[PDB]
Structure formats: structure tokens, C-alpha cells
Design a protein around this ligand. Sequence first.
Ligand code: IV8
Ligand code: MG
Ligand code: ZN
Length: 313
Amino acid sequence: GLMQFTLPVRLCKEIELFHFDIGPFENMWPGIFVYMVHRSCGTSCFELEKLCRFIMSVKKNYRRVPYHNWKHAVTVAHCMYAILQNNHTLFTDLERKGLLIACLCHDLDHRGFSNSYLQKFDHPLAALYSTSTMEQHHFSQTVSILQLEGHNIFSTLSSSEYEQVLEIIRKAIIATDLALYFGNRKQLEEMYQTGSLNLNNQSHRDRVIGLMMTACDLCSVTKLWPVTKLTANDIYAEFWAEGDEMKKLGIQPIPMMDRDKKDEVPQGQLGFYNAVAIPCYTTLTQILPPTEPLLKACRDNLSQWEKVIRGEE
Ligand SMILES: Cn1nc(N2CCCC2)nc1CCc1nc2ccc3ccccc3n2n1
Ligand SMILES: [Mg+2]
Ligand SMILES: [Zn+2]
């Protein structure tokens, strides 16, 4: 009840910044997450015994793959924590509660393969969910973990608040299917420019939370250069293993997933930063001005990739 979570002085200050890295000590990641819920939500959002058991079942259901693992989950929650702390008064008590849980759960039980490879392997998850295949599985794993005994952190919600919070978490997790991102940003662009964008229109909030989820999920491109470079090794380790598997089925992988195109990595980051990342944080800054540091850090890292191509590092 009277039990606060604290962090050492360096973390206590650095955690409020957008570019914070959660570090290599795994056993401190849960404390970091609880710290962020208490400061963001209040010490009275979740029963502490239930929250701690939910976090450890969630951790237990992430796999030891090079990128889509428990570390990514907590990194994506921290970015959402920073967005929520710099835009305090734009979000409901239910939105704050639901969006940090969404971020922790958003890649539950990922296997290190794209929706694409599941469909070409004919995996049973691709017969049960024809589109946003892994993302419907992730929400489904979240609901399974919430119905374990002693795990329902939303116990104290009213019956109707309960339904609204599971609806926020479901839309939030679907939105991390980058195939849905392109359409969502275009529509957000035109609504803010024609002045029609209205935050009381529920379906408009949906789109804005959609874009926030894309931004948090890409936040690896908004870190200090050596965090960004070293996370890119992990991202390619999965893509190239998927490439290897595509070839086993007798299929040319796209160049992104072909380890024979190691040389072309710098140029492939350029495309990603210009087609996806810059547009994402550009639109997000327009809609939510205090997120500007995500835009500025993305641009700095783009300039670091240009530097790699010119042999300056
Ligand atoms: C288009 N394209 N072509 C290539 N290659 C072709 C030839 C050799 C490289 N690579 C890419 C982009 C790769 C990529 N996809 C993601 C998805 C999420 C993400 C989040 C944080 C940081 C980086 C991230 N990246 N990075
Ligand atoms: Mg995902
Ligand atoms: Zn993710």
C-alpha cells in the first residue's frame, strides 16, 4: 500500500527521456515496468500481487529469438510511457492502463517469422487468422494469460470498463501489423491537414493510438547510434533465418531476408527510414507536438546510416 518502487539515480532521471535504453540486466526489467505503471497510472491501478504474477506469465510466454523477445516488449512499453508522460491530459484513466499492458503483450509468443512465412509454410495459425496472422495470435495470448487464476489485473474494473479496456488493447495490438500502418498514416495526414481531425470522434482516437503503437514498436531507430546499430544486427539475424527457411521451401526470399545481400544493409535502412520511420514520427509530431524528440533522433540515425555508405564509419 505505502510501498513505492524506486530506481538508482541515473535510471530515475534517464527513464523519463525518449532515448532511454533499459539495459542488459534482465531481472530489473519487471521493476522498470512496475515503476512506469505507478508513475503513469498511480499506485492504485493494479493489485501488486496480481500485476507481478501477470508480468512473469507474460515474460514466460516470450521466446528466446534474437529480436521479438521480452527485451523488445519492455523497450516498446517504455517508449509508450514517455509518450503518455509528455501528453498527460489528452488520455483517459482506461487508455493509460490499457496501452502499457498492450505494449508489454504486443508480440506475445512470437516465433521470429513474418506473417508472410506463416502463410507460405501453411502454419495452422494462418488457417485460423487469414490477415494480421501473428497479431491476432498476440491478442489471443493476452486474453489467455488474463483468464489464468490470480492473473486478472482488471478484476476491479466495472463490467463495461473491462470490455472497453480489452477493446483498446485489441485495436492497439492489431495496429502493430505494419501492413495496416501505411493506410492509417495517410488518413491521419489528410484529417490533420483539412482540419477535420477530432479527438472526441472515437474512431479518430483509434487511428492516433494506432500511430503511437507503430512509433513505440519502431523506437529502436530513435536511440543512441550504438543501440540502433547493435539492435539492427538482431533484426537481420531473424530476417536472414526466415530467408534461409524461404529457400528450404524452394522460394527466393525478398532481398531484405537474403543473407547474400549483407553488403546492401546501409541502403536498406535508408529506404526503411524514408518509406516508414521518418513519415511515422513526422505525422506523430504534428498530431502530438511534445513527441518531437522521436522525430529528431530518427533523423540523426538516418544521417549515421548515410555516413556508413560514404565509408566515414
Ligand atoms: C526495406 N529494406 N530493405 C532492406 N535490405 C535489403 C538489402 C539489405 C537490407 N532492409 C530493409 C528494411 C529492414 C527493416 N525492417 C524493419 C522493421 C522494424 C524496425 C524497427 C527498428 C529498426 C529497424 C527496423 N527495420 N529494418
Ligand atoms: Mg509484432
Ligand atoms: Zn514489436
